[PDB]
Design a protein around this nucleic acid. Sequence first.
DNA 1: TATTTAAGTATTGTTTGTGCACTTGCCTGCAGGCCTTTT
DNA 2: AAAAGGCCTGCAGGCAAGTGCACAAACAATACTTAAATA
Lengths: 157, 135, 544, 328
Amino acid sequence: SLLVKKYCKMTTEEIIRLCNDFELPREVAYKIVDEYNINASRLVCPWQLVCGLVLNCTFIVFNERRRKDPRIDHFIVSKMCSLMLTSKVDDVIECVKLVKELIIGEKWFRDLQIRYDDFRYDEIIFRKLGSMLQTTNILVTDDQYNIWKKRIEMDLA
Amino acid sequence: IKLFLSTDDNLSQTYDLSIISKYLLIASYICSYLEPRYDASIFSRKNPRYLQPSLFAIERLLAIFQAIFPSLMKANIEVFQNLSELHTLKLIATTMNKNIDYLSPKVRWKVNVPWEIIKEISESVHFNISDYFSD
Amino acid sequence: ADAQRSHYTVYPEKRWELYHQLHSHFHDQVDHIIDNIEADLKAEISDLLYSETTQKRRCFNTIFLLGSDSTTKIELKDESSRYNVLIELTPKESPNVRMMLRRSMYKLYSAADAEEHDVSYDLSLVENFKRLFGKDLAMVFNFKDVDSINFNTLDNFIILLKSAFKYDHVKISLIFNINTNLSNIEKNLRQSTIRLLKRNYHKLDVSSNKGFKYGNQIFQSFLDTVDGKLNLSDRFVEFILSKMANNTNHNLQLLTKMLDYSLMSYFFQNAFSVFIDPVNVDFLNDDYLKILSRCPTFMFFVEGLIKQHAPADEILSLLTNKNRGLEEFFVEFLVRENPINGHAKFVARFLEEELNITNFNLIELYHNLLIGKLDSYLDRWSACKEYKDRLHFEPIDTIFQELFTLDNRSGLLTQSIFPSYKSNIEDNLLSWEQVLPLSGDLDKIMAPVLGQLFKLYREANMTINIYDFYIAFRETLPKEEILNFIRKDPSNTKLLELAETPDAFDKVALILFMQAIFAFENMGLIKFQSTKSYDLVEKCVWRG
Amino acid sequence: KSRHTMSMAPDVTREEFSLVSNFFNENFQKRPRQKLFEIQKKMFPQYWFELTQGFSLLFYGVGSKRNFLEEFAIDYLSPKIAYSQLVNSIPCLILNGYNPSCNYRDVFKEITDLLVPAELTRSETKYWGNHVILQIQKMIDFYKNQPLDIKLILVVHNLDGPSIRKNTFQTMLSFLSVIRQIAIVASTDHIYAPLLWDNMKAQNYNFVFHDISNFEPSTVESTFQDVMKMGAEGAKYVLQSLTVNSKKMYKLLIETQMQNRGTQRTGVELKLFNHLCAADFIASNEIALRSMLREFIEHKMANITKMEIIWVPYTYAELEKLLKTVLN
DNA sequence: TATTTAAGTATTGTTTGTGCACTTGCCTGCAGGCCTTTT
DNA sequence: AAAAGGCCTGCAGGCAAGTGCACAAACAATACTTAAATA
């Protein structure tokens, strides 16, 4: 299991390998490089934050197929569950959920969301301005919940 | 005998004030000897114990506070809340008037608590103060 | 136009009904305990005010109010054949000795008139009083907020009053509303006058926060007001505990405030409030059926089904494939009574009268309960060892509660009740894009003046020059866009003639600067150090 | 220690300044302002439901509220919530906090008649012994047993105003806001707003906070405040109204002080200045000279230091401008 | 014989005044450090 | 090679340039009081 094998450097070449095997485009690849550069100064355990951030970026760089085809959602966690040599899905869903919370407010995330025009403004205008009708993140959003529901269903049935 | 030897004319209190208030007060005491010439040295991010205290200025108190609060906290609603609490308790009074203090005109703040209650607040909050005073 | 005048006035739902019928029960129990404590305070003060027949009868009896809010109203005995006149002095009413005396005399004379239906505002009014009003006098002084009054003045005033004890047809009593720290008072007065007050004193306390006999009690009443009808996660409880601990004097008022605000948030966004009572099971909609899918309990229990029930057929059939069966599967666990509240009340009243424990908090007790560390809670006193198995309660992991509860995961209330007042401003000023979406060109290629000036602001030292910053901002100023934008309005004549001025760039630079530094003084960031000089200034705020 | 002094700046007449501020502030970020405003207007029923529980609504966030304040209050809240009660739309008591002429005494004299005069409470009017606070205490004792509906909506612009922020005024407004049947909504600009209220005053206010950032130019607020532009130009009008002899003598002064920004080294000595104003036959002696000089001095129209230097602190540019325009 | 308040009284609130200060260069006053010799 | 007479240089001997500024008093007009004119 590589994930449990913490305390390892993922250099510019190594991190660009980790983000090139999955073929991530220019802007997101260079942002991965820069954010690992930053996260090295502020890491606690590297592999967790690394896998979380990369999965959370990949899951929105290609929403035009993930939302379109629920199977590639399982395909990514399967190909990295093996690439990271993980134990099961549970640990990877911990990773994604927590890190996504830890990267949901970073400006780079807003920039990735706004730039590609794929799909945020509606949430910022109800969190900053403070409406009583924003979602309290105790539930899961109907879009990610649709993803989960459909993926686990087509995988089970 | 058990009376002939003490006046008992008094009719160090564990002041009701809270953690944020404890730190506010214990930091607002730090420039009863530490002029702004030294604070940015002994507190950076990298005897006048006897004499009457010199005058603070706001946003210096906030500075030393954010310094010695145990990045953890940046909210300042409870902070200023307890600051006004203090000023109502006349523990850190203003040399200037009683109404315009809460603007930012020329206005100085100074502690009105002696050093023993400072020892008390420090030990109770477990933060140590013997460091910042050096002579 | 006229707006520059001073304050010229201008003379121009089932969920909600449940909010009413429940919020009002909440406030009803609130106000019940409120009047309880109020009558308690009035009763204790009226009691202690009398019956203390001190044979000396040459020194007014003193009543200290430890931790007094200073807002506690006072009542008196009617006590016919003797006026009972209350006198209240504020630290504003006390510029000196003479005016304190005169204001007090006028007040008590007006009161003697109202009770009575040419007089010197002085001590003579005391001894003439009988002759001028018949009944003997008994006044009581209520120094509203003592800590701020200049104690030399108050001392002189008390020594003055001492002379009134040579008439014997009057008696006086003092009511000190100390904010706190009786030691603070006995630090300032002349010891010889303390020895005059110390004749018969009573260190009666007035504090809403004392052993939580009202705090824990109102917390429990709230628990009752919310019993079996919702839930509250450990996050909510710990947040309440934290924000309470930093607000010493008035915990209760703020506690009610935050609870009510959470309830309002719920009943204004939560759609399942109508589903704490079965009488609205017919209030269900297909879209409500959809939204009851995204529950975290929903997905967790789907996973538990897939794991435990190896045959996927039952789970698949009970899934979206059925809607009436699915909603029955949901309402199946809707009636989890959650003994957590019941056993909470149990252990509460138990250690209140069985163990009879007082210096404790039911709030953190309920926190431990939802955690299960209630053992490492009750251990604190070493008296439930024999009971930690009869007061035993392992926390139960109720299900489907993720729809009937309240937790601050979005920080809506926290950000709206306890905002980072300076941090929020610094953020929204420097960033400004998350809020701000012919002339759009400059807005898209040049920040709003406020933030693009704030950012130069940031690199400034303690003392800064006006004009150095002016030039460093001129650098930021695009003259090409300034001529793009000024002549972009041809419709105006005078603005066009302005637009052809050859030195217009630095002129408009000074214009925009002297509007910005203008509007950034009432906002508190910058200080115009030494008005009449304004050659340099200081940057008050720093990011930190 | 050669610092950039605001003296060496391109001054702008009040007309050009006002007009360009107009153009900008009315056209700089219009589309952003209207988008922001139409977006945030959806929050208004949220404010309705919040003020249903009398939570004093405090508004922060950069940019002026005054416009938006009167906008939300006068137009949406008052008449809608008046209709919602089941008739004069509830009088909107706007407090021009930026106006430093507001005083607690008179505004409460208004408030009184606004509030219920059910009894001759004027009989309780007394000496300076403040019946503001005592009478408002009584009014609170009354309202404690009155039905619950807004009978007046007061709104304060810039609660940190130079008058309202006075702690006496603040405490008065606190004990006021304790009343349930009134809706309290206000805003500030001072970033240090929370410094104003202890837990006592917070308990009185029960403040609920909301950010409103729309990045306004603070139109009205720019009016009451004033900066150095709001001297060289001061004297520029003075010299436009003088006698020809004064014109000529100041002409000679400005030549001999501009020959050498008009710096002090470039001035003249009063010895040679008298020599000149006596050679060209202008000054008879030193007394009349200093007399016809102090008319400039008695309005601070020229500088003098020490040689006996009389140096015009007005810029070389502005000085030669005087020459080419108003003197010659 | 009482509602008009107009003038007047008592008081607030604030204005620059300075009275004192305490700062930050300055070369020289001083003193630890280098030269010398002898075994 | 080191220890003892003698003489050279680093530390500061020092203090006027000098601004801040925290003291004070009337301050400009507050806020309110008390006698008079009219029904």
